[PDB]
C-alpha cells in the first residue's frame, strides 16, 4: 500500500493510506474561478466532464 500526493502538481510527496483505508483517487475540475485536484484516498465520487480517476496496484498514481 503506497500512493503519492501531488497536490495540483505543486510538490509531489509520498503518503499511503492505512487504519483500514487502501484506494487512490484522482479527481480534478476546472471551472469559473473555481479549479482543484486532489489525488490521495477515495474512490466514490463522479460526475460528468470533471475528471476522475480511482486506482490501487500499489504506486498507481502516475
Not at 482543484?36 to 502516475?62: A, H, L, M, Q, Y
Request: glycine content about 12%; some cysteine.
Amino acid at each position: 500500500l503506497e500512493c503519492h500526493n501531488q497536490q495540483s502538481s505543486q510538490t509531489p510527496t509520498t503518503t499511503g493510506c492505512s487504519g483500514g483505508e487502501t484506494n487512490c483517487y484522482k479527481k480534478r475540475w476546472r471551472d469559473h474561478r473555481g479549479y482543484r485536484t486532489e489525488r490521495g484516498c477515495g474512490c466514490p465520487s463522479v460526475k460528468n466532464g470533471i475528471e476522475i480517476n480511482c486506482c490501487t496496484t500499489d504506486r498507481c498514481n502516475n
